[PDB]
Amino acid sequence: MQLTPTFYDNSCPNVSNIVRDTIVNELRSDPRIAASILRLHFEDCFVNGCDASILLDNTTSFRTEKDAFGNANSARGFPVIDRMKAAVESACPRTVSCADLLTIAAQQSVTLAGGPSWRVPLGRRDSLQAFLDLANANLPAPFFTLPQLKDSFRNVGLNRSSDLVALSGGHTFGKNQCRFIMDRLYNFSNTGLPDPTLNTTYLQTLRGLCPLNGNLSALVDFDLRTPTIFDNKYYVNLEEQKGLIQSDQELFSSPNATDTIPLVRSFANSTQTFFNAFVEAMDRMGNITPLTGTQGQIRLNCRVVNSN
Numbered sequence: 001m002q003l004t005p006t007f008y009d010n011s012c013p014n015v016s017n018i019v020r021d022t023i024v025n026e027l028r029s030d031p032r033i034a035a036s037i038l039r040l041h042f043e044d045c046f047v048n049g050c051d052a053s054i055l056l057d058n059t060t061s062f063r064t065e066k067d068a069f070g071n072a073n074s075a076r077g078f079p080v081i082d083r084m085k086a087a088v089e090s091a092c093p094r095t096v097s098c099a100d101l102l103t104i105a106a107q108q109s110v111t112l113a114g115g116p117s118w119r120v121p122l123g124r125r126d127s128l129q130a131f132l133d134l135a136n137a138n139l140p141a142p143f144f145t146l147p148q149l150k151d152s153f154r155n156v157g158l159n160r161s162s163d164l165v166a167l168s169g170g171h172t173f174g175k176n177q178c179r180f181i182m183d184r185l186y187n188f189s190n191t192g193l194p195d196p197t198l199n200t201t202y203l204q205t206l207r208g209l210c211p212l213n214g215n216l217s218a219l220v221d222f223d224l225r226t227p228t229i230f231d232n233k234y235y236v237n238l239e240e241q242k243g244l245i246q247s248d249q250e251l252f253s254s255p256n257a258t259d260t261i262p263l264v265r266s267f268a269n270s271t272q273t274f275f276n277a278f279v280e281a282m283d284r285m286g287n288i289t290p291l292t293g294t295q296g297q298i299r300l301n302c303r304v305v306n307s308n
């Protein structure tokens, strides 16, 4: 069955607004919630498709993807998802899936943060289990080379250059832990020297935030220009060698960036072009092997599988 943005138009016409209201309220106390939620959707989609598998807690028949490298002590916003689900279950009992709810949340988070607005295709259902081993192998790492980032995306069906470059724009807001850039700052690639593609003046600033013996969990803004605004500032930074993580700067400085550089240049000088590409990439990502029809279920509680 094909996903459609009109899926809940009759069964729960107000799910969108309920989701938005929840985020709007949380934003007051947590300015970063919008970035965390968009990332939860991405982490979900890349492991067995967008089926809300990342939301499941540990059970005795399978381990949680929340423990996966990249997710453990990194992913967040779960109790917020719990709140959205409860509000929606009240208005529309057993109607909206966690997988679809997380998809709308990601979209509203982008819009609320100043990004484009669009109706995401819906109709996805929830998985009956989590896949930790798959997560540990399918999620791209910050130390990946351009070709490795490409293999990683092609692996789940996103075999276009615009997919990698456009979705990477998700790093236009949010934070990153010092621990993930330490090598770029003090000993890159076992050379005892910092990454040569890192702006030297910016390297000073970064070394100040992430001292060699400091707190590895200290957070740093992904986008030094507009840290919380969803815009194309992320691509401008790359052009100045100010991409925060290796996988970031590689889109512009890697010797394999022949096909990505033109897209960086383009997105950096046109918000409309970037937003179009982002919406198109997002919908494509939201379409990775989804459960539909009778497959999977509609979780009452996103943290656990329905007993029946």
Ligand code: HEM
Binding pocket: 032, 035, 036, 037, 038, 039, 042, 073, 074, 075, 076, 140, 141, 142, 143, 144, 149, 167, 168, 169, 170, 171, 173, 174, 175, 176, 177, 178, 180, 245, 247
């Ligand atoms: C190209 C491969 C990618 C790599 C290697 C990667 C790596 C990372 C890393 C290292 C962090 C920080 C983790 C932490 O400090 O706890 C992170 C955070 C984040 N990523 Fe990515 N990422 C990738 C793709 C994406 C995509 C496609 C999106 C989705 C649009 C995305 C959205 C985000 C957001 C918004 C955050 C910050 C979340 C928060 O502040 O809570 N990432 N990513």
Ligand SMILES: O=C(NO)c1ccccc1
Binding pocket: 043, 069, 070, 071, 139, 140, 141, 142, 180
């Ligand atoms: O966000 C990640 N993958 O999408 C990630 C983050 C840190 C380490 C490994 C992977």
Ligand SMILES: [Ca+2]
Binding pocket: 043, 044, 045, 046, 047, 048, 049, 050, 051, 052, 053, 054
């Ligand atoms: Ca999943």
Ligand SMILES: [Ca+2]
Binding pocket: 172, 173, 223, 225, 226, 227, 228, 229, 230, 231, 232, 233, 234
């Ligand atoms: Ca920004």
